[PDB]
Design a protein that fits this description.
CATH superfamily of the largest domain in chain A: Bira Bifunctional Protein, Domain 2
Subcellular location (chain B): Cytoplasm, Cytosol; Membrane
Radius of gyration of chain A: 26 Å
Oligomer: homodimer
Organism (chain B): Homo sapiens (Human)
Shape of chain A: globular
CATH class of the largest domain in chain A: Alpha Beta
Bound molecules: phosphoaminophosphonic acid-adenylate ester, the ligand O=C(C[C@H]1NCCC[C@@H]1O)Cn1cnc2cc(Br)c(Cl)cc2c1=O, magnesium ion, zinc ion
Family (chain B): In the N-terminal section; belongs to the class-I aminoacyl-tRNA synthetase family. Glutamate--tRNA ligase type 2 subfamily. In the C-terminal section; belongs to the class-II aminoacyl-tRNA synthetase family.
Strand content of chain A: 25-35%
Strand order of the largest sheet of chain A: 3-7-8-14-11-10-9-22-23-21-20
Largest sheet of chain A: 11 strands, mixed
Number of strands of chain A: 23
Largest interface: A-B, 58 and 55 residues
Number of domains of chain A: 3
Helix content of chain A: 25-40%
Protein name (chain B): Bifunctional glutamate/proline--tRNA ligase
Distance between the termini of chain A: 29 Å
Number of helices of chain A: 13
PDB class: ligase/ligase inhibitor
């Protein structure tokens, strides 16, 4: 039974939803959480989709070491020194001090790029396109939250190297679109594609692209995934070079990208679609789409009810519906109703003795709570149609929620007003770091830049000025409070 | 390849794994990069094993890599001898942690306290969980790519049951799946058995194992492990329930655990690899057939030759053969032949202009080097037949190799002579630990350890037969080992 209310105490609601749905168990180490099968199945679904898509682009999976030597991690300016407090260091095996401390990967640039340098011995060795599914550790300073901000997390990280900037540029947007597909088509979460400002972009790259989602309940936006064009920044640092085809004796530096997406996805799904009855799973990622529960309780008559439930589950597996028959005798129908509702199963298939004799059943959709009596003969078609509509409804409702909470403002006064109402807002922005710092300080709790959107809500007025008082606007920029 | 397998195994192994593009070396000792060619084998193993354990009702999950100091030391989960293998995180940045944190060497200490919370009644059992994850053990022993690494990839399955019998059943089901991984996928013959008292997992009831033999080394290697833990861990962690029908009695869960690692790939390499390089069993080969255009004619004709190679690719994909067309024009056919030979692609398909005009192609088997001219129309049928034959060929060769190198001995001196010829030996054994300590010392004066007590030993132990030492309990496989 879900106790807490989403609009009252979000922290309590979230904790209750992730535990009662059997997604998460708490660990004795801060910021670490056990991913039980219910949570892990969602990651496997995201993985199956994304992996097949990057394979089509020619990306190959690999596995690089988790340990990075002190030398390698600090070899070059791969990361700003401000990341130092996030690195977890192994310093001994048993009671025996290691000659040099070793770091647990916070990301794999420093481990992969020296290998890239060895492997690139001519123009013929490019492109290199590698991905790995692995765990990552960062000793996060912010309050830890299951999925959203964890000390250990699962991710994929892709790292590509090309001869030309144009090849690289294409991939950045192709991957970002895949991330947008993960959120919008799998998880039914609308996102805003954009580029990070000078201040917020990855310091090791030329430009950073991002997808941003919004969590209404929190009044906070969240970065869903990241895709960088690194340019020649890392290839100059690690000497990833090839001979110029036309001119003898000239070095050419490889163009590089990196991109990543994490189990944060599941938290966003939870925060966006979850209600006061628990988790709500988009049909596309639900490992159980339909749960069959026998209702009502002769000895031979119960055998026939079970047989009908088994008939429904056999037929549903025939049309590639992911179905579970909960034929357990140790649990009451009521318990089961609640159990699978908390777990967010899109459709409950109720079979009673009364409905069975009328050659019919009841379909209860998780999202709206709507109950539909349908005839037995149309089980395959109707249930597949309801699953499709649940997926559409979840996306539609979240889209209207984003449309409501993301508006335009052109002055600092209206900006403050809209941000304090629990919304994010697109403002004319000069792009300066000075001004961005100033925006953060004045609104503080303080609003941060999220992205410069690819497709802003409004076009910029001819000669429009920044929310500042000294500079013209370069672009509409999405600002808000964030995770 | 510069080195030869029969003279310098270590040099050969290093050359095979690098020139097949499986492994790159890292600057941390005992840590190796798995490039795509290696990682694809692991994905193939994963795909098979994952599907099979799902059929048994096992679900995947992910438990944390970090084990708190207090959790690692809470119960007698592992012997004290393991302590030096534990890698400890002691600081974040320059800030020392109040209490140090261990990296997962295995997950009992993180999983079993969760199992104890999750089991509130009989209806909470069985629990059947698996994770695919990385593990760290600061190995004192000589590290080798795949076979013995400081970081490795594995699956660990941990199950809890209401009854001993359910648990006992799963133990042998999992060991058979490991045998299938070796025998059916990687074409490696293995010996199923129980570990001796000295060699078993200390806290468990009994340990079952699959042992493989690497002829080049004259050394055996454990391929996978499946333990019945009985109620030993459930008593420690309080994984308990009470049955209302049996009032006043605590029912401790019966547990198993089991694991298999990337060592698999190293065994495959060591067993099937030759002096031309890697040899991939077709069942795990991510590229089963490579199509190479030869004898390259106008651009129009070159286009036609490429289109023919592409037509073979589509036809092969159509019958579920994993195929690649190496259509790169920066390299010669001769360079490609060698390149894919080194990578152990089972079949090379040669297509030249004369072949097109004749309606034929050339297929070359990696395992034997046999070159066959095949009628164009028979491509799907013949190449599938050849792939099936390569797999059988590899398994037969390896099977005949084990059978030759595993024989029965009945005395300490016969045992010694056979062992020193680079073989493994089934001997009458009493079962006592001290006797096994004695054997390891005597055989060295590079000693021989117990491998397993085979489920189906070569010879039946006659009543009243004495140990090589006490009367013998069973024939036991012994040998030099990784
Ligand atoms: N501690 C964390 N736990 C879970 N997911 C995370 C965490 N940190 C980042 N992510 C997500 O995973 C991706 C990690 O790539 P990265 O670009 O390194 O994030 P980041 O720049 O550190 N973000 P932030 O820490 O919010 O400033 C991001 O796009 C986030 O969606
Ligand atoms: N360092 C390693 N690298 C790769 N594989 C390993 C390593 N250690 C063990 N394995 C394999 O993975 C399984 C790990 O389970 P486990 O029972 O912990 O091995 P173990 O008893 O430590 N073997 P050993 O180290 O030879 O005494 C074993 O069956 C081995 O096949
Ligand atoms: O991790 C990145 C850059 C990109 N790496 C590959 C996948 C996608 C990802 O956006 C930014 N980043 C974030 N956090 C970090 C924390 C530490 Br500690 C270090 Cl050393 C380095 C970093 C660091 O480089
Ligand atoms: O890891 C095991 C027992 C089993 N665990 C689950 C997967 C299969 C595996 O055989 C034996 N073992 C091996 N090596 C270890 C190293 C260290 Br360090 C520790 Cl703390 C503990 C252990 C330890 O328990
Ligand atoms: Mg961060
Ligand atoms: Mg060991
Ligand atoms: Zn400004
Ligand atoms: Zn003896």
């Amino acid at each position: 039974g879900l106790e807490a209310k989403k609009e009252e105490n979000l922290a309590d609601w979230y904790s209750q939803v992730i535990t009662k749905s059997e997604m998460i168990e708490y660990h004795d180490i801060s910021g670490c959480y056990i991913l039980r099968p219910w949570a892990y199945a969602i990651w496997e679904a995201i993985k199956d989709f994304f992996d097949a898509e990057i394979k089509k682009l020619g990306v190959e999976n690999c596995y690089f070491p988790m340990f990075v030597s002190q030398s390698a991690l600090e070899k070059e300016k791969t990361h700003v020194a401000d990341f130092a407090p996030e690195v977890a260091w192994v310093t001994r095996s048993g009671k025996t001090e290691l000659a040099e401390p070793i770091a647990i990967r916070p990301t794999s640039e420093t481990v992969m790029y020296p290998a890239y340098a060895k492997w690139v011995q001519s123009h013929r060795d490019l492109p290199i396109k590698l991905n790995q599914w692995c765990n990552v550790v960062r000793w996060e300073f912010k309050h830890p939250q299951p999925f959203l901000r964890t000390r250990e997390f699962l991710w994929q990280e892709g790292h590509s190297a090309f001869a030309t900037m144009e090849e690289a540029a294409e991939e950045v947007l192709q991957i970002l679109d895949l991330y947008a597909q993960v959120y919008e088509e799998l998880l039914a979460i609308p996102v805003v594609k954009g580029r990070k400002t000078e201040k917020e972009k990855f310091a090791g790259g030329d430009y950073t692209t991002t997808i941003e989602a919004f969590i209404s309940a929190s009044g906070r936006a969240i970065q869903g995934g990241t895709s960088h064009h690194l340019g020649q920044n890392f290839s100059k640092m690690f000497e990833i070079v090839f001979e110029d085809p036309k001119i003898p004796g000239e070095k050419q530096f490889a163009y590089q990208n990196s991109w990543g997406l994490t189990t944060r996805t599941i938290g966003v799904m939870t925060m966006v679609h979850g209600d006061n009855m628990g988790l709500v799973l988009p049909p596309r990622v639900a490992c159980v789409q339909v749960v069959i529960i026998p209702c009502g309780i002769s000895e031979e008559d119960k055998e026939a009810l079970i047989a009908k439930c088994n008939d429904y589950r056999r037929r549903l597996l025939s049309v590639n519906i992911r179905v579970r028959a909960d034929l357990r005798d140790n649990y009451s129908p009521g318990w089961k109703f609640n159990h699978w509702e908390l777990k967010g199963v899109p459709i409950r298939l109720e079979v009673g003795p009364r409905d069975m004799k009328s050659c019919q059943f009841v379909a209860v959709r998780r999202d709206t709570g709507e109950k539909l009596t349908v005839a037995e003969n149309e089980a395959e078609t109707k249930l597949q149609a309801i699953l499709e509509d649940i997926q559409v409804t979840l996306f539609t409702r979240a889209s209207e929620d984003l449309k409501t909470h993301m508006v335009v403002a052109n002055t600092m006064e209206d900006f403050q007003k809209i941000l304090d109402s629990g919304k994010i807002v697109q403002i004319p922005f000069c792009g300066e770091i000075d001004c961005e710092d100033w925006i953060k300080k004045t609104t503080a709790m303080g609003a941060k830049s999220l992205c410069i959107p690819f497709k802003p809500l409004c076009e910029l007025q001819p000669g429009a000025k920044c929310v500042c008082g000294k500079n013209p606007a370069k672009y509409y920029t999405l600002f808000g409070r964030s995770y």
